[PDB]
Amino acid sequence: ALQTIINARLPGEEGLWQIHLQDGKISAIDAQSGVMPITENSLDAEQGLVIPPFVEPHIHLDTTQTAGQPNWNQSGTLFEGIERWAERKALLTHDDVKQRAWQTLKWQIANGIQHVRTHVDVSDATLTALKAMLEVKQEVAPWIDLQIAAFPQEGILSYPNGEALLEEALRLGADVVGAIPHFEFTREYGVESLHKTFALAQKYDRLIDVHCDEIDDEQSRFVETVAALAHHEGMGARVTASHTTAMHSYNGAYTSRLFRLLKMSGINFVANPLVNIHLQGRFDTYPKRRGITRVKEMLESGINVCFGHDDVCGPWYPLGTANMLQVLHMGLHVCQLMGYGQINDGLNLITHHSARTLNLQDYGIAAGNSANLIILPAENGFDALRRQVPVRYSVRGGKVIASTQPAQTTVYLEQPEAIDYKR
Amino acid sequence: ALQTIINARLPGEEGLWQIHLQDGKISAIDAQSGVMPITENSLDAEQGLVIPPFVEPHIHLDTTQTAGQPNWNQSGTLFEGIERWAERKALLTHDDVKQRAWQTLKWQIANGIQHVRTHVDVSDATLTALKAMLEVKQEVAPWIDLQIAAFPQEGILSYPNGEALLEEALRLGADVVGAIPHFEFTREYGVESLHKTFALAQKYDRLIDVHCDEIDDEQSRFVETVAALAHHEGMGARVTASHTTAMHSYNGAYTSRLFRLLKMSGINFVANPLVNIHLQGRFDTYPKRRGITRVKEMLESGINVCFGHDDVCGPWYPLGTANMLQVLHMGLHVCQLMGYGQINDGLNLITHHSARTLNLQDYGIAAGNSANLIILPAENGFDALRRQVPVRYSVRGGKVIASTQPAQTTVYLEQPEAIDYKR
Ligand SMILES: [Fe+3]
Ligand SMILES: [Fe+3]
Structure with missing residues (x-):
C-alpha cells in the first residue's frame, strides 16, 4: 500500500x-x-x-467515563474531585477499567493521537486499575504507544504503604513515577516525597511526572524541588511537572528567580487548560483568577511546556471528546496567546512539545x-x-x-x- | 412540502x-x-x-473579517482594538462592508442562527457602514432577522457631532440605540450620554443596547444608570447592558445592592465569553482575572443574561466561525457553570435568553x-x-x-x- x-x-x-x-x-x-x-x-x-x-501528555484513563459515579463533583474543586474519585475507586473492577480506558482510547485514535501518557492511581493496595491498564497498554499498542504513570493520588507519605505501593507499581512495569507533594499532610512530607520519587526513578530507570502545586496557594513551591533534583541528577529530559497552577499566583520576583532554575534544569511542564479553568479560582469570589501555569512566559523563555486534557468525562471534568485542538483552543484563550503567530504556533503545544515531555525517541x-x-x-x-x-x-x-x-x-x-x- | x-x-x-x-x-x-x-x-x-x-445578540458585522487590516491588535486590548478599527474605518467602502457582513451572515445561517443584532459604528460622518448594513438587513431578511444597533464607538459627547450622528442613524432606520459610557472622556459625560441615549430611544420608540463598563475598572458603574433609567421609564424589556465586565471586579457588597435594582429594572445582559477572556485581565500580571460579568449570579437571581460572539475575525478577536455552541462552551468554563444541570441548561443562554434580549415577539x-x-x-x-x-x-x-x-x-x-x- x-x-x-x-x-x-x-x-x-x-x-x-x-x-x-x-x-x-x-x-x-x-x-x-x-x-x-x-x-x-x-x-x-x-x-x-x-x-x-497529536500527543496526550496527561490523562487519567482509570477515571475516564465515570463522571457522576457514584456522585457528582459538585463544588468543582480538585479536593472534592479526589473524594468523589475515592468513592469510585472502591468500586473498580478489572473489566470496568479496561472498558472505560478503551472507550476513551478509541476517541483518541479517531483524533489522531498516537502517544498517550495515562496516570493511574496506585493509592490502592489491590492495584486494580494498574493491572487492568498494563493489559490495555499491550492491547492498544498497534495504534497508541501508552505510557503508564504510577500516581500516588493520596500521597506517598500520607497514605498507608504509599511508598511501597508506588515501588510495587514500578516493579509491575509502570513507565513513569508520580507524586503529589501539595496533597501530602505537610510541606516537609511534600519535599521528602520528591526525594523518594527521584530515588525510585533512578533505581528503576524510569521517567518522572509530578502532579505539582495543583492549588491556588502562592506558598506551594514544590516545583523548585522537582527542578533542583532533576538538575542535580542531570536528568531534566526525563522529568515533568504537571499542572503547576500555583505558579499563576506567585509574585513576579520569585517567579523570575525560579525561571533561571527551570531553564537550567531542562524539565518539562504540562498545563491542562480545560480542567485548570474549571477547578482553579474556586476559592476566589470576584475577581476570580484564571489559574493556568505561566505558559506564555515559559514559551518566551524557551522552557518546554505543552497541553493535556487531564480528565475526560471523569470526577474532575464532566466534558470532553479527548480532542487536542479543543484543549489548545482553551489554553490559547485563557493564556492570552492570541497573536496570529502565537495561535499559529499553537500546534507545537500539542505535538512536538508534548513528544519532548514523553521523552519520545x-x-x-x-x-x-x-x-x-x-x-x-x-x-x-x-x-x-x-x-x-x-x-x-x-x-x-x-x-x-x-x-x-x-x-x-x-x-x-x-x-x-x-x-x-x-x- | x-x-x-x-x-x-x-x-x-x-x-x-x-x-x-x-x-x-x-x-x-x-x-x-x-x-x-x-x-x-x-x-x-x-x-x-x-x-x-440560535440567536446572536451581539456582533459587529461592520468589523467582521478585518483581522489584521491594516494592522494587528497586538496588545490584545479593547483600547488598541478601537485604534486599529479606527484605521480600518477610514478605509471602508459600501461594497467592502456588504461583502464582509454577508460572509459572516452565511456562516451564521449555516450555524442555525436566524436572529442577529449587529452593532454598527456611527462615529463616522459618512455613515458608510450603516448605509451598507441597512441594505444587508433587507437582503438577508429571508434567512435572518437582523437588528441594527447604532453604536457611537468613539463616544456620544466625546466625538464631534456624536449625538447628531447617533440621531441621524435612528432617522435612517437603526433599530437600537447604543452608547459607550466608559469610553467617554469623563464619568460625567458617561452619565450624561446615557440620559441622551434614553431620550433618543423614547423619541423614536427604539430598543437600547449599551456597551456598558467594558473595562477592568472597579469604579466603572454605568450599569446602575442604565438600570435606573430603564426602571424610571418602565422600559426594562427594551434595554440591554452589553459586556459589564467591570462587574467581575466589583466588591461583593456593592454588587448585592446593585442586584436588587438589576432585577427590579428587568433589563437584559449580554456576556461575550470568547472576546472577554481575551481582552480582559490584560492589565493584570499574575494572578490574572477572568473578566466576564457575573453570569452565574445573574442566573441564580433570575436576571436575564445571554451570550454573544461579539467579533468574528475582526480587530478585537482574530478567531471564530460564528458558532454559538462554541461561545457557550467558553462561557460555561470561564463562568464555572460546570454542574451537569448548568451545562445542560446552557442552551438557554444562546436561545431563549437571547430572544428576550432582542425583544423578539x-x-x-x-x-x-x-x-x-x-x-x-x-x-x-x-x-x-x-x-x-x-x-x-x-x-x-x-x-x-x-x-x-x-x-x-x-x-x-x-x-x-x-x-x-x-x-
Ligand atoms: Fe492529572
Ligand atoms: Fe461589541
Whole structure:
C-alpha cells in the first residue's frame, strides 16, 4: 500500500511537500514546485497540513467515563474531585477499567493521537486499575504507544504503604513515577516525597511526572524541588511537572528567580487548560483568577511546556471528546496567546512539545523516523485551530489507522451554497 | 412540502414530540409514545433535540473579517482594538462592508442562527457602514432577522457631532440605540450620554443596547444608570447592558445592592465569553482575572443574561466561525457553570435568553408561532455542548434553509469501527 504522502503543507515551511514512505518509515521528504497528481499508493494531503501525531501528555484513563459515579463533583474543586474519585475507586473492577480506558482510547485514535501518557492511581493496595491498564497498554499498542504513570493520588507519605505501593507499581512495569507533594499532610512530607520519587526513578530507570502545586496557594513551591533534583541528577529530559497552577499566583520576583532554575534544569511542564479553568479560582469570589501555569512566559523563555486534557468525562471534568485542538483552543484563550503567530504556533503545544515531555525517541516528520503522521484539512495551525478541524487521516507505520470524512454544510439561499467557514 | 417534525426531543421535557406545521407556522405540538415512522413531508429529527433558532445578540458585522487590516491588535486590548478599527474605518467602502457582513451572515445561517443584532459604528460622518448594513438587513431578511444597533464607538459627547450622528442613524432606520459610557472622556459625560441615549430611544420608540463598563475598572458603574433609567421609564424589556465586565471586579457588597435594582429594572445582559477572556485581565500580571460579568449570579437571581460572539475575525478577536455552541462552551468554563444541570441548561443562554434580549415577539416552539426551529443531532443540551454538534437542519417559515451532513469518523482496528464520541 502507501508509498507517498503528496501535496503536504508543513508548519513553518513554505510551499508543498512530498513525503516518501518505505518499510513503515519515512525514507525522504522532498519539496514540490506545484500540485502533484494523485495515484494509487499516494495519500493526497490536498494542500492540508501534515504533522506528527497529536500527543496526550496527561490523562487519567482509570477515571475516564465515570463522571457522576457514584456522585457528582459538585463544588468543582480538585479536593472534592479526589473524594468523589475515592468513592469510585472502591468500586473498580478489572473489566470496568479496561472498558472505560478503551472507550476513551478509541476517541483518541479517531483524533489522531498516537502517544498517550495515562496516570493511574496506585493509592490502592489491590492495584486494580494498574493491572487492568498494563493489559490495555499491550492491547492498544498497534495504534497508541501508552505510557503508564504510577500516581500516588493520596500521597506517598500520607497514605498507608504509599511508598511501597508506588515501588510495587514500578516493579509491575509502570513507565513513569508520580507524586503529589501539595496533597501530602505537610510541606516537609511534600519535599521528602520528591526525594523518594527521584530515588525510585533512578533505581528503576524510569521517567518522572509530578502532579505539582495543583492549588491556588502562592506558598506551594514544590516545583523548585522537582527542578533542583532533576538538575542535580542531570536528568531534566526525563522529568515533568504537571499542572503547576500555583505558579499563576506567585509574585513576579520569585517567579523570575525560579525561571533561571527551570531553564537550567531542562524539565518539562504540562498545563491542562480545560480542567485548570474549571477547578482553579474556586476559592476566589470576584475577581476570580484564571489559574493556568505561566505558559506564555515559559514559551518566551524557551522552557518546554505543552497541553493535556487531564480528565475526560471523569470526577474532575464532566466534558470532553479527548480532542487536542479543543484543549489548545482553551489554553490559547485563557493564556492570552492570541497573536496570529502565537495561535499559529499553537500546534507545537500539542505535538512536538508534548513528544519532548514523553521523552519520545521516534517522533516527527523526518527521514528515518517511523511513518507516523496525521493530515489536517487546514492551511496552517491558525486555520486548523480556528475551524476546529477533524483529523482527515491518521497514519501509523505507513498505514491508515483512522479517517474522517468531514461534515458537509449547505445553505439554501437563492441557490444552494456550500459553507466551509474559510477565510 | 414540510407538514411535520417527528421524533423530536425538547429541552426540559421527557420523551419524543411531534411538531405539526401549517402555513409557515407551528399548528400543534403533540407528545409521542414511541418512535414515529418517516414519510414524505415529515422531517425526522431522529431523536435529536429541536429548539428555536440560535440567536446572536451581539456582533459587529461592520468589523467582521478585518483581522489584521491594516494592522494587528497586538496588545490584545479593547483600547488598541478601537485604534486599529479606527484605521480600518477610514478605509471602508459600501461594497467592502456588504461583502464582509454577508460572509459572516452565511456562516451564521449555516450555524442555525436566524436572529442577529449587529452593532454598527456611527462615529463616522459618512455613515458608510450603516448605509451598507441597512441594505444587508433587507437582503438577508429571508434567512435572518437582523437588528441594527447604532453604536457611537468613539463616544456620544466625546466625538464631534456624536449625538447628531447617533440621531441621524435612528432617522435612517437603526433599530437600537447604543452608547459607550466608559469610553467617554469623563464619568460625567458617561452619565450624561446615557440620559441622551434614553431620550433618543423614547423619541423614536427604539430598543437600547449599551456597551456598558467594558473595562477592568472597579469604579466603572454605568450599569446602575442604565438600570435606573430603564426602571424610571418602565422600559426594562427594551434595554440591554452589553459586556459589564467591570462587574467581575466589583466588591461583593456593592454588587448585592446593585442586584436588587438589576432585577427590579428587568433589563437584559449580554456576556461575550470568547472576546472577554481575551481582552480582559490584560492589565493584570499574575494572578490574572477572568473578566466576564457575573453570569452565574445573574442566573441564580433570575436576571436575564445571554451570550454573544461579539467579533468574528475582526480587530478585537482574530478567531471564530460564528458558532454559538462554541461561545457557550467558553462561557460555561470561564463562568464555572460546570454542574451537569448548568451545562445542560446552557442552551438557554444562546436561545431563549437571547430572544428576550432582542425583544423578539415570535420565538419558541409553540403553537401559533412561525415555524422557525433547528435540529441538533444530540440527546440534550449537555450532549450538544460536549460534542460541539453542527446544526443538522435549520427550518424557517417551515422550509429548510440550511443542513449539515455530519462528519463520519472511522478507526481501523481489528475491524473498522465508527466513532461518534457518545457516551
Ligand atoms: Fe492529572
Ligand atoms: Fe461589541
